[PDB]
Write an enzyme that holds these catalytic residues in place. Structure first.
Site, mmCIF file in Angstrom:
data_model
loop_
_atom_site.group_PDB
_atom_site.id
_atom_site.type_symbol
_atom_site.label_atom_id
_atom_site.label_comp_id
_atom_site.label_asym_id
_atom_site.label_seq_id
_atom_site.Cartn_x
_atom_site.Cartn_y
_atom_site.Cartn_z
ATOM 1 N N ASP A 1 68.364 -89.022 -39.053
ATOM 2 C CA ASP A 1 68.439 -88.923 -37.598
ATOM 3 C C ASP A 1 69.707 -89.574 -37.054
ATOM 4 O OD1 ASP A 1 66.036 -87.467 -37.220
ATOM 5 O OD2 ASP A 1 64.875 -89.318 -37.473
ATOM 6 N N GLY A 2 70.158 -90.635 -37.717
ATOM 7 C CA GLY A 2 71.412 -91.275 -37.360
ATOM 8 C C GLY A 2 72.568 -90.295 -37.441
ATOM 9 N N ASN B 1 67.892 -89.563 -27.593
ATOM 10 C CA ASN B 1 66.726 -90.395 -27.853
ATOM 11 C C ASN B 1 66.401 -91.264 -26.647
ATOM 12 O OD1 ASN B 1 65.871 -89.575 -30.376
ATOM 13 N ND2 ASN B 1 66.872 -91.244 -31.492
ATOM 14 N N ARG C 1 61.473 -109.192 -15.306
ATOM 15 C CA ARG C 1 61.979 -110.290 -16.117
ATOM 16 C C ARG C 1 61.455 -110.137 -17.547
ATOM 17 N NH1 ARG C 1 64.028 -114.723 -12.751
ATOM 18 N NH2 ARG C 1 63.795 -114.100 -10.556
ATOM 19 N N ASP D 1 63.001 -109.127 -21.933
ATOM 20 C CA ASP D 1 64.102 -108.884 -22.866
ATOM 21 C C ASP D 1 64.956 -107.692 -22.474
ATOM 22 O OD1 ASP D 1 63.403 -111.043 -24.347
ATOM 23 O OD2 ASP D 1 62.525 -109.913 -26.011
ATOM 24 N N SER E 1 61.749 -86.098 -26.752
ATOM 25 C CA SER E 1 61.907 -86.162 -28.206
ATOM 26 C C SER E 1 62.204 -87.585 -28.680
ATOM 27 C CB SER E 1 62.970 -85.176 -28.704
ATOM 28 O OG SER E 1 64.253 -85.486 -28.190
ATOM 29 N N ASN F 1 61.047 -95.990 -28.067
ATOM 30 C CA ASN F 1 59.928 -95.874 -27.137
ATOM 31 C C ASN F 1 58.571 -96.150 -27.787
ATOM 32 O OD1 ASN F 1 58.705 -94.483 -24.440
ATOM 33 N ND2 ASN F 1 57.692 -93.619 -26.245
ATOM 34 N N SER G 1 57.845 -97.760 -30.572
ATOM 35 C CA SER G 1 57.760 -99.153 -31.007
ATOM 36 C C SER G 1 57.444 -100.094 -29.852
ATOM 37 C CB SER G 1 59.069 -99.590 -31.670
ATOM 38 O OG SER G 1 59.290 -98.871 -32.860
ATOM 39 N N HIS H 1 72.630 -94.416 -30.694
ATOM 40 C CA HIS H 1 73.161 -95.368 -31.671
ATOM 41 C C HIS H 1 74.297 -96.245 -31.131
ATOM 42 C CE1 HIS H 1 75.536 -91.858 -31.698
ATOM 43 N NE2 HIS H 1 76.167 -92.037 -32.845
HETATM 44 N N1 ZAS Z 1 68.399 -93.124 -36.321
HETATM 45 N N2 ZAS Z 1 68.943 -94.049 -35.663
HETATM 46 N N3 ZAS Z 1 69.499 -94.981 -34.973
HETATM 47 C C1 ZAS Z 1 69.461 -94.942 -33.515
HETATM 48 C C2 ZAS Z 1 68.040 -95.123 -33.063
HETATM 49 O O1 ZAS Z 1 67.560 -96.368 -33.433
HETATM 50 C C3 ZAS Z 1 66.322 -96.500 -32.722
HETATM 51 N N4 ZAS Z 1 65.824 -97.871 -32.676
HETATM 52 C C4 ZAS Z 1 66.506 -98.966 -32.468
HETATM 53 N N5 ZAS Z 1 65.710 -100.001 -32.516
HETATM 54 C C5 ZAS Z 1 64.501 -99.586 -32.760
HETATM 55 C C6 ZAS Z 1 63.267 -100.199 -32.917
HETATM 56 N N6 ZAS Z 1 63.085 -101.481 -32.850
HETATM 57 N N7 ZAS Z 1 62.240 -99.431 -33.171
HETATM 58 C C7 ZAS Z 1 62.362 -98.147 -33.264
HETATM 59 N N8 ZAS Z 1 63.495 -97.544 -33.108
HETATM 60 C C8 ZAS Z 1 64.585 -98.228 -32.868
HETATM 61 C C9 ZAS Z 1 66.603 -95.852 -31.376
HETATM 62 O O2 ZAS Z 1 65.661 -94.892 -31.131
HETATM 63 C C10 ZAS Z 1 67.969 -95.211 -31.566
HETATM 64 O O3 ZAS Z 1 68.050 -93.935 -31.007
HETATM 65 N N1 ZAS Z 2 61.798 -122.182 -19.704
HETATM 66 N N2 ZAS Z 2 62.639 -121.625 -20.457
HETATM 67 N N3 ZAS Z 2 63.490 -121.069 -21.244
HETATM 68 C C1 ZAS Z 2 63.251 -121.034 -22.683
HETATM 69 C C2 ZAS Z 2 62.063 -120.157 -22.955
HETATM 70 O O1 ZAS Z 2 62.315 -118.852 -22.570
HETATM 71 C C3 ZAS Z 2 61.226 -118.100 -23.120
HETATM 72 N N4 ZAS Z 2 61.471 -116.661 -23.149
HETATM 73 C C4 ZAS Z 2 62.573 -116.041 -23.480
HETATM 74 N N5 ZAS Z 2 62.409 -114.750 -23.366
HETATM 75 C C5 ZAS Z 2 61.196 -114.520 -22.954
HETATM 76 C C6 ZAS Z 2 60.459 -113.382 -22.662
HETATM 77 N N6 ZAS Z 2 60.930 -112.177 -22.749
HETATM 78 N N7 ZAS Z 2 59.229 -113.548 -22.253
HETATM 79 C C7 ZAS Z 2 58.709 -114.726 -22.132
HETATM 80 N N8 ZAS Z 2 59.364 -115.805 -22.411
HETATM 81 C C8 ZAS Z 2 60.608 -115.744 -22.812
HETATM 82 C C9 ZAS Z 2 60.974 -118.755 -24.469
HETATM 83 O O2 ZAS Z 2 59.657 -119.113 -24.557
HETATM 84 C C10 ZAS Z 2 61.854 -119.995 -24.433
HETATM 85 O O3 ZAS Z 2 61.220 -121.124 -24.954
HETATM 86 N N1 ZAS Z 3 65.703 -98.586 -35.612
HETATM 87 N N2 ZAS Z 3 65.736 -97.372 -35.948
HETATM 88 N N3 ZAS Z 3 65.782 -96.169 -36.298
HETATM 89 C C1 ZAS Z 3 65.255 -95.892 -37.592
HETATM 90 C C2 ZAS Z 3 64.100 -95.025 -37.506
HETATM 91 O O1 ZAS Z 3 64.116 -94.275 -36.383
HETATM 92 C C3 ZAS Z 3 63.996 -92.944 -36.779
HETATM 93 N N4 ZAS Z 3 64.216 -92.083 -35.643
HETATM 94 C C4 ZAS Z 3 65.328 -91.828 -35.002
HETATM 95 N N5 ZAS Z 3 65.071 -90.986 -34.035
HETATM 96 C C5 ZAS Z 3 63.796 -90.707 -34.063
HETATM 97 C C6 ZAS Z 3 62.956 -89.924 -33.319
HETATM 98 N N6 ZAS Z 3 63.342 -89.201 -32.314
HETATM 99 N N7 ZAS Z 3 61.694 -89.897 -33.657
HETATM 100 C C7 ZAS Z 3 61.242 -90.578 -34.660
HETATM 101 N N8 ZAS Z 3 62.005 -91.332 -35.380
HETATM 102 C C8 ZAS Z 3 63.270 -91.408 -35.099
HETATM 103 C C9 ZAS Z 3 65.076 -92.905 -37.833
HETATM 104 O O2 ZAS Z 3 64.885 -91.782 -38.621
HETATM 105 C C10 ZAS Z 3 64.611 -94.110 -38.593
HETATM 106 O O3 ZAS Z 3 63.467 -93.785 -39.315
#
Ligand code: ZAS
Ligand code: ZAS
Ligand code: ZAS
Ligand code: ZAS
Ligand code: ZAS
Ligand code: ZAS
Ligand code: ZAS
Ligand code: ZAS
Lengths: 260, 260, 260, 260
Positions: free
Chosen positions: C45-46, C118, C144, C146, C154, C160, C162, C219
């Site tokens: 897919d990459g 994607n 608030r 990440d 698709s 999405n 994950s 990507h």
């Molecule tokens: N194939 N490829 N690489 C690009 C894709 O990585 C996927 N990606 C990045 N991080 C995650 C992730 N944490 N879980 C699933 N997919 C991820 C995202 O959908 C991008 O289109």
């Molecule tokens: N207070 N403060 N800052 C530090 C904290 O930010 C928190 N943090 C960072 N990102 C997130 C997050 N996305 N959701 C909840 N808490 C978060 C984490 O618990 C750290 O200990």
């Molecule tokens: N992180 N990341 N990407 C890695 C996984 O995402 C997959 N991927 C990328 N695009 C899609 C996609 N559209 N649907 C399902 N998986 C996907 C890719 O093949 C890897 O298995």
């Protein structure tokens, strides 16, 4: 040592049970399903659960061992092909005891108490489920949704897991409360997150309107009427397992969920 | 008793700090920010976190107290309007010590160790994050996703909670591992569920390809290169709180998440 | 028909590419990587993602086909062993065009627009991520956490998925917004749930404090500074696939996630 | 225009109904609860749901309007204090019709068909729930767990939301399937993710062992026996709302979940 053997009741398990009994007859081992010291469950987790509840009154005098002739068999330590080796080791008495925490459920109307190896859950007897959740006497939340699940450590891999709960190592004396489809909007609010309680913490559920609930304890589901409260705490009682070899909880988890 | 006071550094907090110092001057209390026995944090959790890390080398000789001039202030026990009463009680010495477990993180390349009050997380230094998760030497899973979070009990209400983790009472000596956006398909598999580990269990992360990781410990985020492994365990060290009144963890949770 | 072939670049894929080119030479098919009408991606897919972005300026004149020499290969319709049959069918011109919706991302400081197959995501350039989410000019929430992810149909099986998002059939012209680790407490509130938007709906992200964001489009990950807003909408542009056989989306999903 | 008014049946709602009827009497508006063209529901969503099902046979000839005397009241467009203004506008006929998609459920044993405004769910008649999920004739998964929920767009903010489903704008003609506590281990596998289906896609549930199911359609829950299959599809029928002012779906969502 007195022993008994529960069987899933299918062809495979019954025959395995008979062969093991024959093997035990070759040693100084007496079969006793009244006051056994060792209870062998041949089947799946459902069969193991039944074995536990059959002897929940003698948990202190019993060590359990599971043989896997089921599908998943999480509580099992042995494959059918190893039965002969098991008989031998059980004979020589080469094993160490391992204990898992249990969950106590008290239902008050009169009081009924149940003991759970996996979990205890509550749902409505049909209609909307609403309860006040009280932790150590402090009102924590009013839960609206499908129901609630309170799990033991070893139970966290079961129903608890499906509900988004954390997996909890059995050496931690705790219970975990998970939600089933909680309603959360402008007016209704729950914590959402699973809650993990230590020993000596009491979680009480108290009816808001309807007082009729469907309460489950492992495989058993009972309808309770005119319920005043449901009380959860970590039981003082523990289930004891007979271990003849190293099979770490996390490896058990890996094998059951990641790859065998 | 020697004491020091950290401040959020805004108008409100600085002034409150000065007034408390004045109040302490009326007693036999010496201000010492080198070797204090009591550390008062005036601000939010960010300020409290900073206070903890400023004295992470003397955690055994210090009791912390938080005053809430922030927004949420989970670790705080006091409102600014109660500062005078706090000064008094601290003077008379009417308080009991309460301890929360901490998380030890070891990064090996040479070794660096960090101590966390909330959590320690790992992400990739840009690019795909892939690590083997090893629990007590047994290979448990290969994690592909955004990263991982290892939380203390008191930290379970923070980042951990946002990641779907369970809330864990601080009396339980444990750490909890949660996933960030794990990839799960036909070929890639993770447990999914948060994992709760007891004291003396070691969770190690081992690089698969890229060896560069962004590692956070509470508010601090550091890039580590040529990482050989990241090792988590429940610290032997504990943070001590000075409690002058009953404020149960679950009430703290209720107030912060349900209604204040 | 003019055609070009992208390759993962490994031994397997390069050789497969050469053989296909040889096979195409036997027909009246011209290789043109400037203005091709058919783009064949050999890899995962990459690799497919790269192919799409290489020709995102001629999406209206191109039909894509993927060959799976990667690991998962979601966008692929063919196995390497079928390459010869593909060459033939492509020659005879026996195929129907299928279109999937795309996502338009606009970043304003000047304006830059990106096209995604994607998804497009946003995170902070280090530090806390906070943005106001505005839907069709109405202020919906202050997020608030990440970061956020906006996915095409698709793409819902990728990042999405994950993040807890719904899987969405590609015939539905929509985009889906998912959260990454949202903070939810007494003071901070987000919807939590994925949101699915129809065509002609505009979702705008507006900075609250920090104006620097890390923005990804498939990507590609780019750091943008002095960002005034990020705007998402369903693109008027579509990617076209060349289908020589029935391979339903839901079967594609089953094969990739349930069993192949 | 013929009209009828449903009431929650409490003091507040009944009195409001009487006053509106009086107000309508001042115009050329006839009250008819047999063949009305306008149906006004005074109460909460439960009351609105009842109104819809009371006239599910004349959905093409009716426009619904909800007045909020309940708690949440998602389907309501008016507050009791605005009733007089509503009467007036309804009289002058100053309103535009808006349509939301509905869900068709077919249960085969003989066949029964139901129409849903929010959702249709399936659970076991007590005992383990196991069904094969078939999408457009292709076997997609075997579901083991508590049950399944199929939601309309406007229903995605209800039960669907509690089950982790995406919120879906009502202009999208679709239905969304969510899981209830699916079992996922080495041997049992489900997609996990909510699934969003377009119009003309058919999702069929087929019994594996037990053929008895508890099936719900909005507020109605019925036990069906000897079930051969349950079939879901987007209905050709639509519910029509009478809108006298702009109240966007996403604002409705914001008000109900973020802040009012
Ligand atoms: N194939 N490829 N690489 C690009 C894709 O990585 C996927 N990606 C990045 N991080 C995650 C992730 N944490 N879980 C699933 N997919 C991820 C995202 O959908 C991008 O289109
Ligand atoms: N207070 N403060 N800052 C530090 C904290 O930010 C928190 N943090 C960072 N990102 C997130 C997050 N996305 N959701 C909840 N808490 C978060 C984490 O618990 C750290 O200990
Ligand atoms: N992180 N990341 N990407 C890695 C996984 O995402 C997959 N991927 C990328 N695009 C899609 C996609 N559209 N649907 C399902 N998986 C996907 C890719 O093949 C890897 O298995
Ligand atoms: N529903 N249900 N139960 C079926 C699955 O739960 C499994 N099960 C029962 N107890 C546990 C358990 N404690 N851990 C993991 N799985 C378990 C049982 O083996 C079946 O695979
Ligand atoms: N083995 N067995 N049967 C009893 C177990 O079924 C389990 N169970 C019931 N429903 C579910 C469910 N939906 N998901 C996972 N496990 C479940 C629960 O853990 C009981 O202890
Ligand atoms: N991202 N981040 N951190 C911001 C939120 O995390 C809160 N926070 C930090 N530590 C904790 C904590 N331990 N429990 C709950 N909330 C916490 C902090 O007060 C902010 O409200
Ligand atoms: N369980 N239940 N239902 C109670 C909540 O669901 C609400 N509800 C019913 N239908 C919807 C709906 N479509 N969207 C949001 N909330 C809804 C109803 O108003 C109650 O607040
Ligand atoms: N209003 N009302 N009652 C009927 C609605 O209750 C809703 N409902 C039932 N159980 C739950 C639940 N657990 N969470 C949210 N909504 C629920 C469902 O959407 C029905 O249409």
């Amino acid at each position: 040592m007195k022993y008994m053997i529960t069987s899933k009741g299918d062809e495979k398990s019954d025959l395995l049970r008979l062969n093991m009994i024959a093997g035990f007859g070759e040693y100084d081992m007496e079969y006793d399903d009244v006051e056994p010291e060792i209870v062998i469950s041949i089947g799946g987790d459902g069969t193991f659960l039944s074995a536990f509840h059959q002897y929940e009154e003698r948990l202190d005098e019993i060590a359990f061992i599971g043989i896997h002739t089921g599908h998943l068999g999480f509580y099992a330590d042995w494959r059918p092909a190893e039965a002969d080796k098991l008989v031998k080791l059980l004979a020589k008495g080469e094993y160490q005891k391992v204990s898992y925490p249990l969950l106590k459920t008290t239902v008050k109307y009169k009081e009924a108490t149940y003991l759970a190896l996996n979990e205890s859950t509550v749902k409505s007897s049909g209609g909307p489920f609403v309860v006040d959740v009280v932790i150590n006497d402090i009102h924590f939340e009013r839960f609206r949704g499908d129901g609630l699940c309170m799990s033991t450590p070893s139970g966290t891999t079961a129903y608890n897991k499906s509900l988004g709960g954390a997996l909890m190592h059995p050496s931690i004396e705790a219970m975990q409360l998970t939600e089933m489809a909680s309603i959360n909007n402008r007016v209704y609010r729950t914590i959402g997150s699973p809650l993990v309680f230590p020993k000596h913490h009491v979680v009480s559920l108290q009816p808001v309107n309807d007082k009729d609930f469907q309460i489950s304890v492992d495989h058993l589901s009972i309808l309770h009427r005119d319920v005043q409260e449901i009380r959860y705490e970590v039981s003082a009682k523990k289930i004891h397992f007979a271990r003849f070899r190293s099979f770490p909880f996390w490896r058990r988890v890996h094998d059951s969920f990641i790859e065998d």
